[PDB]
Amino acid sequence: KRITTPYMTKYERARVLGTRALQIAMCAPVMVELEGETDPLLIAMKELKARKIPIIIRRYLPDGSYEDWGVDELIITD
């Protein structure tokens, strides 16, 4: 089971977009079709809107145990 909040905190969104933009900057394969945009951050934002990013968050509770959430099952909000 999982106890933490089910929404995506702004910090998680920021670090996910950052690390995915960096991965697409180097020639990684892109998981969504692009219409001709040539800016990594906007491609990563579109991917997240399509919810296809291959990144798994690992939330460390203070004691040392952890919980894993796929970036597709957090409730993304505004």
Partner 1 sequence: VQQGMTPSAKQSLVDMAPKYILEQFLQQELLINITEHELVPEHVVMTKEEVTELLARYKLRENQLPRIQAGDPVARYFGIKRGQVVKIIRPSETAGRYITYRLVQ
Partner 2 sequence: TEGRSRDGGLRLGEMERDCLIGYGASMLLLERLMISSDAFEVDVCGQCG
Partner 3 sequence: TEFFFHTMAGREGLVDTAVKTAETGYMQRRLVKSLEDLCSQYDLTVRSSTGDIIQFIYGGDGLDPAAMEGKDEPLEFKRVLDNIKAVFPCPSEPALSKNELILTTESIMKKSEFLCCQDSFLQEIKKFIKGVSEKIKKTRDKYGINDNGTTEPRVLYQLDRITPTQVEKFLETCRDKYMRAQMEPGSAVGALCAQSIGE
What angle do the packed helices 40-50 and 10-25 form, to 10 degrees? 120
Nearest CB to partner 1, comparing residues 2 and 51: 2
The percent of the chain in helix, strand and coil, each rounded to the nearest 5, is 35, 15, 50
Yes or no: say if 20 and 44 are a contact pair by the CB < 8 Å rule: yes
- Could you say whether residue 70 binds partner 2 (CB under 8 A)? no
**Binding piece for partner 3, criterion CB under 8 A, among 9-17, 19-27, 39-47, 48-56:** 9-17
- Could you say whether residue 5 binds partner 2 (CB under 8 A)? no
| Least gap, CB of 12 to partner 2 (angstroms) | 11
